[PDB]
Design a protein around this nucleic acid. Structure first.
Ligand SMILES: Nc1nc2c(ncn2[C@H]2CC[C@@H](COP(=O)(O)OP(=O)(O)OP(=O)(O)O)O2)c(=O)[nH]1
Ligand SMILES: Nc1nc2c(ncn2[C@H]2CC[C@@H](COP(=O)(O)OP(=O)(O)OP(=O)(O)O)O2)c(=O)[nH]1
Lengths: 605, 605
DNA sequence: TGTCATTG
RNA sequence: CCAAUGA
DNA sequence: TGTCATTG
RNA sequence: CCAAUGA
């Protein structure tokens, strides 16, 4: 007596008593049944698979040439919708993707609270391997594993592994396991406080990424085929007297006298040596355009081309990524040659929708301010709260004891020391990086961390905490476990120490930018009566008018990219600033710098 | 090099150049691809199959988890839509059904001109066998028969015979044959004038029946379970001194002295004999409720039960029918017993939607008026144009030479003679029917048809026309072929003669009621801003508010049933009268009598 | 591949 | 009588 | 299952 | 230096 399915749409008494039962349920699972048409090699959504306890699934379908139950999309769209008083926690496996396909097939704008188990078991152990439905079942909810023998999926929902088994069967089996497993995950997240952040940061952020993935990013093939010639034409320049792999550039041709070639870090007096410029430009027309101008998609509804990124997460730090052609990795603008300069990059081939401007918002010295908070460094806090240049002023402040109004441009080497200490690199490599001596660098380190005595007493505190705990937790309490902090090998433990400091600092940075993106979105879908993403317009208005409002476009770790209409681009920037500057209330003022333009090779206001 | 399919949605250049090509096409075929989900034993629409020449099909699909082409329903709904200047002739095989399923799955309210080949080849030869896609191919367009070998469907569209073959393949094969065949059918309909009536009566009427089939008819199980007891309780009454098949009622029990029993047509002085009342009531609780209360369907969107009839057509006369429980065949109201009377029928268990009233419109002596037109019977025409009682006045007029103001109730036997002559039954059976003598009946016939000399000279004219032609054509020119009018056997030829008169008279009746229903609908969907059938509300508003307007509910040969809202039930009745009374301009005034009530056991205004 | 009912 | 069902 | 580039 | 890709 194992696993029962209830074909809900198979009657009328059964269906109307079903949604009655359903419309007073707070928690319940959901799983799309997606089957392939005979090939016509296209997939299609053919049924929900709602469950809310035990081994009992309620399979909705989308019903053979009938005249009753033709309001089937209405019933789902009406149940998958917050309606004040109580909103529902809807556990969905590949939630990010599910949300998309649930819209780009049948115009259902899922508007509830969500609880993905795939990200719940990540949050438990961020150094875990990418969790499958199988893996989740194998660990949590050990029994009901026999329901997977023959299913054979190690990636996404039962939809994503469509194999012989009917859409309804697996969709039902998903909902059962997904529901009952998430209940055990919720129990563990509760045990270590992570349920609060999972529900009010990590899942809300997942929903934010879903919106971003639907929107995508504008891409001008025109202004990309511009750089395709600007770079290639100014590639083979003044080259008097065949570039290949490694063994090619002989130093026995001219005149330190080793091999490698990568470290051509002189080129000052000895010859022109314009090799690094060629090496960059060539490697910046191949990891940017030629893999990307193949994923470009003409979207005639918008009347432009766009690319559709796939957010990653499941990152040990907490920073969000993208698969394939990752738009985070396109190189920023830089000069060339012709005496006369020009500025190039593929960041000029990323465009707003016609009549709009792209909006960037960087946090500017966020990881610094996090350490300033955690490390109760008296003057380090007070230097940041003044709103003065946080490197001009930090140079004086106490490092060089006095200057304040005239303190040169040793700020450029004042930050180099600052970041060099928090990055946790040895005096040797820092000294080689600044262009000074290993000794005099070690002197500058000690003469900085003494003048800001908080930094070093913080690191020694958090490393000893990590040694006794076996893990370190960020400012939102998300733990990362490190077994290397016990290791006998000095290098391995030393590596574990600078792993611990990184995750508690630039993980807490990932935490604030999450809280920032969700608090923005909540505040963003209010004043603007014209509703949400490009998906909820090409898809939801397609089954439920100018382009007012702004949409989430790109996540750059500590920087956010939005795409706003020029009409109301000023009313949004206030929403972005005020929300990011108040995301978390710290002992240090969170400042942000916003830039507005026709790409993201643009100036500021 | 045979049969090419173009997966149109497989690109973007291909798709956008496709609908560009399409949006300037006047004629083109269409065929729904309908595949079954694994069982979840429900069918689903998965693609159009547009074609417009040769062996080249353009297969639309409804596309795998993508972000471009998610406006797919819009593109069809926008192409399947008249847009002024030019409207498109859309050839669809099982058009009546196709239209329904094209709406009760994906909210596409097909709004073009239509050309069904299944009804085009009926119109050619109404005594033909029910035409299949195979049969249409076998006769017209003899080649491309090999495209059917393995398909094996002998009923409906390639959808309706879903078997192993992919929805796209057969849907494409349909569109090719359907298009190219209909072109040959259009050529034959042109050759004999029938293309004009096919396009402006027969197909428009088919569309009218589609609307009716979507609407259905209200059915109160409450007021049906009323008669279920009223009839059954007043069934076994005063029965002093075991009813079975035939051999049971012996006349050797009491006291003309044969068998049969069916002809208990005395029961006057000899005993009560209340056997015909029991025989009727029992056979009127079994061919009306017990086969029908099983096809009743709760439709919660309307908040009532309804039944969904399936119109027939392909009738030698031209009158439209319904399959299964045919609502045309429910017996009208009649009295019973308790001294004290009550009136019963199942026509009291057919109801309007809450807040509405049912509207009936009978043509009253239509077949008479058709004969009055065709047979140029001078006074017969003039008797009908006065608007006086057309049987009180017809009794005098000339039959009894004079009376006019006092002419008794021999009108009841004046019409009996009238209908008896046009029905074409012998003096024998008419005489037995009126309760007079075969001789004195034959006298009354000759003394009527002499006083109205048109009737007999018309019949002798049209029978000699039919003898030389091999067929007779109605007032709209729809031919019916009769090989029996040559037959040596006197009975067979005599039968063929009264077949000829019937079809030219009560076929021309089917023609006017068609023209009536289409001219009503055209005038009906105008003033009423709130749009069309119950299908275009539970289905089209479901993918494109009170219940103002009126909808086509039942076709009773010469009578139409509508279902109108009480708010504006007076504004519609004017539309129905004026349209039916002007359907065709004859030499005789077409009068109509309308009845309004809470069922169709109701009174008039 | 008969005969009787119901509706028009 | 004719046309649709129906025993 | 190495080393060099890009982004933060 | 750490984390994501990438030769
Ligand atoms: N051949 C034939 N035609 C009929 C018969 N009954 C009606 N019709 C045709 C010709 C006139 C027209 C009237 O249809 P209705 O049944 O609405 O009218 P009725 O008042 O019941 O019939 P009638 O006019 O014979 O008195 O339909 C019938 O029994 N046989
Ligand atoms: N470990 C590490 N963290 C970095 C690195 N670059 C940036 N971060 C983190 C810490 C500060 C923050 C700044 O990100 P951005 O790249 O936007 O800032 P930047 O001005 O380019 O860098 P920086 O502050 O080091 O001068 O992100 C890096 O190379 N290593």
């Amino acid at each position: 007596e194992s696993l029962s399915i209830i074909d809900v749409a198979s009657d009328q008494n059964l269906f109307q008593t079903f949604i009655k039962e359903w419309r007073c349920k707070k928690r319940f699972s959901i799983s799309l049944a997606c089957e392939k048409i005979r090939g016509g090699d296209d997939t299609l959504v053919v049924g929900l698979a709602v469950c809310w306890g035990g081994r009992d699934a309620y399979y909705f379908s989308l019903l053979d040439p009938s005249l009753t139950l033709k309001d089937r999309m209405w019933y789902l769209q009406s149940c998958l919708r917050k309606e004040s008083d109580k909103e529902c926690s809807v556990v969905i496996y590949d939630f990010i993707q599910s949300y998309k396909i649930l819209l780009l097939s049948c115009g259902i704008s899922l508007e509830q609270s969500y609880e993905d188990p795939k990200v719940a078991c990540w949050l438990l152990d961020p150094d875990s391997q990418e969790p499958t439905l199988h893996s989740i079942v194998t660990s949590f909810l050990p029994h009901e594993l026999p329901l997977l023998e023959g299913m054979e999926t190690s990636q996404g929902i039962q939809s994503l592994g469509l194999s012989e088994h009917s859409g309804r069967y697996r969709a039902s089996v998903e909902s059962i396991l997904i529901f009952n497993s998430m209940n055990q995950l919720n129990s563990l997240l509760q045990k270590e406080n992570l349920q609060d952040v999972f529900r009010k940061v990590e899942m809300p952020s997942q929903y934010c990424l879903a919106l971003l993935e639907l929107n995508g990013i504008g891409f001008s093939t025109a202004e990309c085929e511009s750089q395709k010639h600007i770079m290639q034409a100014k590639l083979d320049a003044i080259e008097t007297q065949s570039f290949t792999s490694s063994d090619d550039i002989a130093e026995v041709l001219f005149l330190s006298t080793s091999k490698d070639v990568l470290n051509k870090l002189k080129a000052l007096h000895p010859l022109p040596g314009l090799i690094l410029e060629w090496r960059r430009i060539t490697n910046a027309i191949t990891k940017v355009v030629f893999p990307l101008q193949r994923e470009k998609c003409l979207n005639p509804f918008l009347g432009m081309e766009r690319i559709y990124p796939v957010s990653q997460s499941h990152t040990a730090t907490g920073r969000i990524t993208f698969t394939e052609p990752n738009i985070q990795n396109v190189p920023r603008d830089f000069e060339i040659k012709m005496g006369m300069p020009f500025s190039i990059s593929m960041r000029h081939a990323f465009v707003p929708f016609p009549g709009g401007s792209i909006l960037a918002a960087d946090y500017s010295q966020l990881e610094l301010r996090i350490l300033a908070h955690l490390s109760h460094d008296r003057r380090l806090i007070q230097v940041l709260n003044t709103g003065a240049d946080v490197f001009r002023s930090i140079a004086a402040e106490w490092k060089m004891i006095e200057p304040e109004s005239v303190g040169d441009d040793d700020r450029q080497q004042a930050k180099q020391i600052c970041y060099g200490i928090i990055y946790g690199m040895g005096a040797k490599s820092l000294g080689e990086q600044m262009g000074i001596k290993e000794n005099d660098a070690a002197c500058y380190i000690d003469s900085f961390k003494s003048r800001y005595t908080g930094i070093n007493q913080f690191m020694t505190e958090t490393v000893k905490n990590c040694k006794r705990d076996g893990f370190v937790q960020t400012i939102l309490g998300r733990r990362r476990y490190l077994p290397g902090i016990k290791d006998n090998n000095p290098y391995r433990k030393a590596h574990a120490e600078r792993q611990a400091i990184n995750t508690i600092v630039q993980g807490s940075a990932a935490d604030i930018v999450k809280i920032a993106t969700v608090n923005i979105q909540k505040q963003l879908e209010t004043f603007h009566s014209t509703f949400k993403s490009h998906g909820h317009r090409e898809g939801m208005l397609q089954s439920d008018c100018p382009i007012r409002g702004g949409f989430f476009i790109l996540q750059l770790h500590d920087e956010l990219l939005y795409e706003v209409a020029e009409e109301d681009v000023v009313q949004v920037a206030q929403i972005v600033k005020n929300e990011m500057e108040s995301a978390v209330k710290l002992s240090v003022k969170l400042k942000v710098k916003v830039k507005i333009g026709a790409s993201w090779g643009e100036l500021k206001d």
